Design a protein around this ligand. Sequence first.
Ligand code: CL
Ligand code: MG
Length: 265
Amino acid sequence: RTFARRARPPAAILFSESMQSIPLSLPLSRTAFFFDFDGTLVDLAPTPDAIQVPPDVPVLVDALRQLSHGAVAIVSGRGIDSIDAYLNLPGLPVAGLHGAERRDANGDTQRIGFDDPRLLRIERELAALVDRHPGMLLEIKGAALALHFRNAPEREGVARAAAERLVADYADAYVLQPGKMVFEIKPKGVDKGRAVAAFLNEPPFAGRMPVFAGDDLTDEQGFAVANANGGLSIKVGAGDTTARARVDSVAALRAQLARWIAAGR
Ligand SMILES: [Cl-]
Ligand SMILES: [Mg+2]
């Protein structure tokens, strides 16, 4: 009785399942761009509060957003408010906290897990943990927590055991997200891949070829969704990855975006 007629997909480029060379140019108005922030567009710093955002970063993101007609999103482990504090690009789509909060292109923000009483109990146990271990840093991120040990590398084992134990106590609601010198505890059932897939179901992203660039383990789920949709996944820096392309550094990734912009306008 009812049918499912599609319009020819606006994507004009498809990447196969193989390693790929980063293209010289992309049809910016038929491409969707998803970027991690720390370690991807900006260098990783000794602590989250110590990152340095060069002026090139907001200029390049905003030019890509103009030339692509809005199909640019940040998909970060930071909160949306933090991303806003560093880029100050009004109305930029942002998935923050690994997908635990998301602002769409209309400017509507959805959050899960904020004010959850279990997170406050987890936070209290981690606060006692970092009290006993100088050099560890507990970062409280709204609905998520980050247990840092970059300045206490000898405490990676105790950080892992504590975070794994607390997550297991609430395994129905929370999940562990390891990263570079950090263990993050975040609501279950949201991730960077799901956030990308949600963007790709909405204008202006829907139907476009997706690009996802990232540097850490959380970003592998973004690479997975970009690859499943025939797009271009870019790992920044060293490490095993499912990304189809790789660049050496934040500066080298920045240089790729700059070339795509120049080739566009
Ligand atoms: Cl993720
Ligand atoms: Mg990162």
